[PDB]
């Protein structure tokens, strides 16, 4: 079956990323199609029948705002090679945590850039939400990026304007950390469809986009080809089992049934698992997802499984289920992680103890020691034991959890190695766990 990849689309409010993302989903997927159908029919009123996809998208938006559409916010579309789960990045401030600890981390980020002179500049501001999103993606290891310069119609498909925008955008993303040479730059019109799915006829000078990859140079013309050219990432199927619990139910005649997302490895009936940080061990009686009973739950599946001799009381949300015979999960005395401080009205000193969200855990952890301040992009140590951290700083920090906690090094188990630091009604920092002092 088409392989599965996740994509997050980011950009300034005036970039036109919603119309852009909407167009892809509209023509390459099947979301709220009954609503789309209604408006395609209604559009006959505009003239004698012809209609712009962007018009239909506009009407769908208003319909969604009324709260009467039927499909959920989980959006997908297809490319020749993939089934893409896409997220048109909300501007909502609470989305930052969701981006960090939510399920479905991105395999590629698509940065939509407005081509108009005023709108372009407003978009690359040093304090803009767009840069923060880009920084968060890079920090979380989203190394694949695609840039689409939208609204090319408003600048009359001028080659020089496109080139200057590529230039300035490359500087913008380079400062974040991406190597522009690996990024395809696609001039598009989300409203008119140019280079979206079919190549444009408004720019004779356009030879197509290109990107250097490890195997060679890849080229294409459209945004869809760019997406289809995203490189296949390797999935955790092969790593030990890790399943953070979201809920634990007590069902009559069946027993204890924890529910959670399989982040790494596979869960199957017959395995003997352990729940950290508690340390409880038991056999997996059966596994279920939606309506079907499973022979196995693979990475990505949100499954419910039944275990015996475990009061629901002895395991809870935040605990991590793993294989007892293949690097079983454990609590920790502390963990050291690289923390990137986001823009926020404050400064961090050793002793700081805000709530940390890691997988399904919500625990206050002390910034026990500020070990080093590092050059963010290279990781080079700039100083030992800084006395405080301010927005923009990248640093190695020793954390001591206030409650029993199970975390992993980002290198070994990514979904349990990244976290969000909450404070001031916002995520003030993002962490990547580098070492864990486990518990025995």
């Amino acid at each position: 079956e088409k392989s599965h990849i996740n994509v997050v689309v980011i950009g300034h409010v005036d970039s036109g990323k919603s119309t852009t993302t909407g167009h892809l989903i509209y023509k390459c997927g099947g979301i709220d199609k009954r609503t789309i159908e209604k408006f395609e029919k209604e559009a006959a009123e505009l003239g004698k029948g012809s209609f712009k996809y962007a018009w239909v998208l506009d009407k769908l938006k208003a319909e969604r705002e009324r709260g009467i559409t039927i499909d959920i916010a989980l959006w997908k579309f297809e490319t020749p090679k993939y089934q893409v789960t896409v997220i048109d990045a909300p501007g909502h401030r609470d989305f930052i945590k969701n981006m960090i600890t939510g399920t479905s981390q991105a395999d590629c980020a698509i940065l939509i850039i407005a081509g108009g002179v005023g709108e372009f500049e407003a978009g690359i501001s040093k304090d803009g939400q767009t840069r923060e999103h880009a920084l968060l993606a890079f920090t979380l290891g989203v190394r694949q990026l695609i840039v689409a310069v939208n609204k090319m119609d408003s600048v009359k498909w001028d080659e020089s304007r496109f080139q200057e925008i590529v230039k300035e955008t490359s500087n913008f993303i380079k400062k974040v950390g991406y190597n522009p040479k690996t990024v395809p730059f696609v001039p598009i019109s989300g409203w008119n469809g140019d280079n979206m799915i079919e190549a444009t006829t408004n720019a004779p000078w356009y030879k197509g986009w290109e990107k250097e990859t490890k195997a060679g140079v890849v080229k294409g013309k459209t945004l869809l080809e760019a997406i289809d050219a995203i490189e296949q990432p390797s999935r955790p199927t092969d790593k030990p089992l890790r399943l953070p619990l979201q809920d634990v139910y007590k069902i009559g005649g069946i027993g204890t049934v924890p529910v959670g997302r399989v982040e790494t490895g596979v869960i199957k009936p017959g395995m003997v698992v352990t729940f950290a940080p508690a340390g409880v061990t038991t056999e997996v009686k059966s596994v279920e997802m939606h309506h079907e009973q499973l022979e196995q739950g693979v990475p990505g599946d949100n499954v419910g499984f039944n275990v015996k001799n475990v009061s629901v009381k002895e395991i809870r949300r935040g605990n991590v289920c793993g294989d007892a015979k293949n690097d079983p999960p454990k609590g920790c005395a502390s963990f050291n992680a690289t923390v990137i401080v986001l823009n926020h009205p404050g400064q961090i000193s050793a002793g700081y103890s805000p709530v940390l969200d890691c997988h399904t855990a919500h625990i206050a952890c002390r910034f026990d020691e500020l070990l080093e301040k590092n050059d963010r992009r290279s990781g080079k140590k700039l100083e030992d034991h800084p006395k405080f951290l301010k927005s923009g700083d990248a640093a190695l920090v020793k954390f001591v959890p206030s409650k029993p906690m199970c975390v992993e090094a980002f290198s070994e188990y990514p979904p349990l190695g990244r976290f969000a630091v909450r404070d001031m009604r916002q995520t003030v920092a993002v962490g990547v766990i580098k070492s864990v002092d486990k518990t025995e």
Binding site: V13, K17, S18, K61, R64, E65, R66, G67, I68, T69, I70, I72, A73, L74, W75, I87, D88, A89, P90, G91, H92, R93, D94, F95, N98, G102, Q246, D247, Y249, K250, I251, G252, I254, V257, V259, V287, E288, M289, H290, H291, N302, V303, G304, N306, R317, R425
Partner: protein, 90 residues
């Protein structure tokens, strides 16, 4: 016009016997400026348990999702927890 995001919240019961109709009515009764409740369905998650999956559209600057999640979770008699199934910009 104000920035909005469409969110799909998963609201989990305590067991397979929890009154899901009361649970969703309690969620929809929640009134906040900039909050629009949308479609919902009761989705099986296994072993006879069904979660509530409900859409809502929020104005970013007026509706705190953290607060919204916390408010729903106040209905302890029906709700064990809530999670964001997905969210998109509008």
């Amino acid at each position: 016009p104000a920035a909005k995001s469409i969110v799909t919240l998963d609201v989990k019961p305590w067991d397979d016997e929890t009154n899901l109709e009361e649970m969703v009515a309690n969620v929809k009764a929640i009134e906040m400026e900039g909050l629009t409740w949308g479609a919902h369905q009761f989705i099986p998650i296994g072993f006879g348990i069904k979660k509530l999956q409900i859409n809502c559209v929020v104005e970013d600057d007026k509706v705190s999702l953290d607060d919204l999640q916390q408010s729903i979770e106040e209905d302890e008699d029906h709700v064990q927890s809530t999670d964001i199934a997905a969210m998109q910009k509008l």
